[PDB]
Amino acid sequence: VGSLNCIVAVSQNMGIGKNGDLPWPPLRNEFRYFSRMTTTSSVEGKQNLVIMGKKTWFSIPEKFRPLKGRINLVLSRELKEPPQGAHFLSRSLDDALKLTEQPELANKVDMVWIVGGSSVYKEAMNHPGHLKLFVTRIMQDFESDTFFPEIDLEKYKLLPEYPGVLSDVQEEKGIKYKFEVYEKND
Numbered sequence: 001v002g003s004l005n006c007i008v009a010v011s012q013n014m015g016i017g018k019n020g021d022l023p024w025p026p027l028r029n030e031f032r033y034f035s036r037m038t039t040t041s042s043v044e045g046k047q048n049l050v051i052m053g054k055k056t057w058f059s060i061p062e063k064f065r066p067l068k069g070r071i072n073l074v075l076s077r078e079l080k081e082p083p084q085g086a087h088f089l090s091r092s093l094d095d096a097l098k099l100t101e102q103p104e105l106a107n108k109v110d111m112v113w114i115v116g117g118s119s120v121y122k123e124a125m126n127h128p129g130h131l132k133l134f135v136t137r138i139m140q141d142f143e144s145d146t147f148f149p150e151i152d153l154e155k156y157k158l159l160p161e162y163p164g165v166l167s168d169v170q171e172e173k174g175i176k177y178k179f180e181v182y183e184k185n186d
């Protein structure tokens with residue numbers, strides 16, 4: 001299995017959701033970036049795995065589920081089988097990553113991308129090991145009801161650039177944003 005990664009877009013007051021939708025109007029190129037980063041696999045004959053909580057799964061418009069070209073795994077203790085359109089179900093993050101070593105996944109998965117929501121991000125971020133965060137900073141405040149966990153900069157180093165990742169300020173629908181990549185290894 002390849003690298004372990006979180007990807008997120010967050011507003012200036014750390015918001016990632018309001019009522020199961022984006023705090024901000026849709027940003028088409030920002031989404032294109034999320035799709036390209038999560039879908040692109042370095043390794044022939046493998047796909048990337050996306051891991052998400054139940055609420056994150058149901059927040060994706062039906063037409064985009066499952067995320068195409070990616071293996072889709074949902075996390076839930078309540079659900080007893082993968083939701084309609086999803087591929088895998090695990091009770092927890094540690095379980096999902098364990099499954100990634102089983103015969104049925106071991107040779108199929110390249111990168112793993114955690115795509116939300118708050119508790120799954122939080123658990124990943126303080127679990128020892130090599131982890132990157134791909135963070136889009138939406139540089140305004142947006143009313144939100146779910147939030148990104150604190151990034152501990154003592155552990156997470158902001159990379160000065162990354163191949164495939166624009167370094168400069170982006171702007172869509174009047175809203176400035178920028179892409180960042182953080183890395184820890186502990």
Ligand SMILES: Nc1nc(N)c2cc(CNc3cc(Cl)ccc3Cl)cnc2n1
Binds near residue numbers: 020021031116
């Ligand atoms: N950088 C970044 N990282 C993520 N994890 C993202 C996740 C999504 C989720 N997809 C989606 C979700 C809702 Cl709530 C409404 C409509 C759509 Cl198309 C969209 N953009 C993302 N950008």
